[PDB]
RNA sequence: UGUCGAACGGCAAGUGCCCCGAAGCCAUCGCACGGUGGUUCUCGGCUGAACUCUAAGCCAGAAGCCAAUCCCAAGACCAGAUGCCCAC
């Protein structure tokens, strides 16, 4: 709604800065072979798209960023702070 | 005050009383120091079977416990290491 933000991913770790107003980084390790980028530049501006091969070795960490999110002593429904896991989906490709 | 003849000097008042007093001791009266790693459960959640967290496969983490730092130290009887050495 208001908070302009930034996020980051540095090779093997993930950063989360100015989350809800928290001006520090929120790290999280990712295993060897799960490569990911952003589309913050312009067209999407929001999404984090996880790719990979294994059912539960990329689902295991596409579960904690939604655990790294909650706003606790606060009404939750009236406003939606968080870059949270979106739309469990089986994306295939023929492009 | 008393007292050594008087000063000087002391002494007696179970340390006369008093001011100051180093050393030592001591004060939340002074001062220094006391911010660490795993493990798990609440739990957010993952896969889905027979669709959801779990029936098996699983991350994750506050306290918690557990060691660790810390204090003691083999009656835990240390075949730990090491220094030195007899008579008969």
Automatic annotation (TrEMBL):
An example molecular function term from Gene Ontology annotations: structural constituent of ribosome
Single biological process term from Gene Ontology: cytoplasmic translation
Keywords: Ribonucleoprotein, Ribosomal protein
Membrane-spanning intervals of the chain: none
Domain Large ribosomal subunit protein uL6 alpha-beta: 3-82
GO annotations of cellular component type: cytosolic large ribosomal subunit
Family the entry assigns: Belongs to the universal ribosomal protein uL6 family.
Protein name: 60S ribosomal protein L9, putative
Organism of derivation: Leishmania donovani
Residues of the full protein shown: 96 to 190 of 190
């Amino acid at each position: 709604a208001h908070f302009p933000i930034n996020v980051s991913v540095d090779g093997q770790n993930i950063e989360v800065r100015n989350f809800l107003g928290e001006k520090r980084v929120r790290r999280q390790l990712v295993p060897s072979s799960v490569k990911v980028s952003q589309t913050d530049p312009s067209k999407v501006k929001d999404e984090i798209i996880f790719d990979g091969n294994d059912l539960e070795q990329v689902s295991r960490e596409a579960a904690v960023l939604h655990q790294m999110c909650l706003v606790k002593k606060k009404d939750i429904r009236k406003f939606l702070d968080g870059i949270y896991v979106q739309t469990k989906t089986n994306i295939e490709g023929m492009e």
